[PDB]
Amino acid sequence: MVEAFCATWKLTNSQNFDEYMKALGVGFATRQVGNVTKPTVIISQEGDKVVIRTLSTFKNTEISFQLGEEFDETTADDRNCKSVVSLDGDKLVHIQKWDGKETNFVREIKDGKMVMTLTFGDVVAVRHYEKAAA
């Protein structure tokens, strides 16, 4: 459940991310710095809401949401999206819709690490995070 994700995570490895970035139409200037930064993602629960903070040398982002309740999200690549995060078994599914398009993130816990899968059509990226000290 959500508890399993409530920790501080540090990005260690990214697979197929540049490809995915470019499928999204992410501009070059955001892309090249998105390939080298290793963000710190801090997930917690305030009341009944999940809070996701992201510390990065490019941008610091923060979002709050209740599971299943749609909300406006301005992504780090400046996409104004209608987003929904829900529980899917033991995984979190984050859906983003914008400009008639859609992309999805799947957060899971495999072997102690947080594995996040990003899908835009047939283009898929996988991002790996290790638990770090709070």
Ligand SMILES: CC(C)CCC[C@@H](C)[C@H]1CC[C@H]2[C@@H]3CC=C4C[C@@H](O)CC[C@]4(C)[C@H]3CC[C@]12C
């Ligand atoms: C965080 C910056 C440097 C990345 C560039 C922003 C662009 C490419 C968009 C597209 C997909 C978005 C990402 C989706 C997944 C993650 C995992 C994590 O680490 C927090 C931010 C991050 C990385 C988002 C930040 C913004 C993002 C990366």
